[PDB]
Write a protein that binds this ligand. Sequence first.
Ligand SMILES: Cc1ccccc1S(N)(=O)=O
Length: 126
Amino acid sequence: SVKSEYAEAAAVGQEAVAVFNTMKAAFQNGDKEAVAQYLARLASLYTRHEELLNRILEKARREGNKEAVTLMNEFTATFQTGKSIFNAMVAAFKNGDDDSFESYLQALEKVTAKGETLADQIAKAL
Ligand SMILES: Cc1ccccc1S(N)(=O)=O
């Protein structure tokens, strides 16, 4: 069902939260080799999450589930905010700009925390 597809999507999102917090600890410790690998792992996780979310939105549209479509349109828009911040973080790491990396890291945390009430609303709407 679309609801179980969203639970699978939610788990992938939680996998990225876990890897992100490990990556933050590695960044603070200066373990740049670990950070590089975690950033690659996060990129793959966000790509998978994005695709699952798009399939869920398209299915809600085909089902005529207007409220779930509204919420998923809002949620995917916020997802792209987080994705843009993530890509800027990756670039900051490439460039050796730790000041920007720290900034983007905190921003991605706040964007993600804000979007959690909506994430829960979607589970209930589908
Ligand atoms: C953190 C991140 C990274 C890439 C895409 C989306 C997100 S978010 N802010 O969890 O929607």
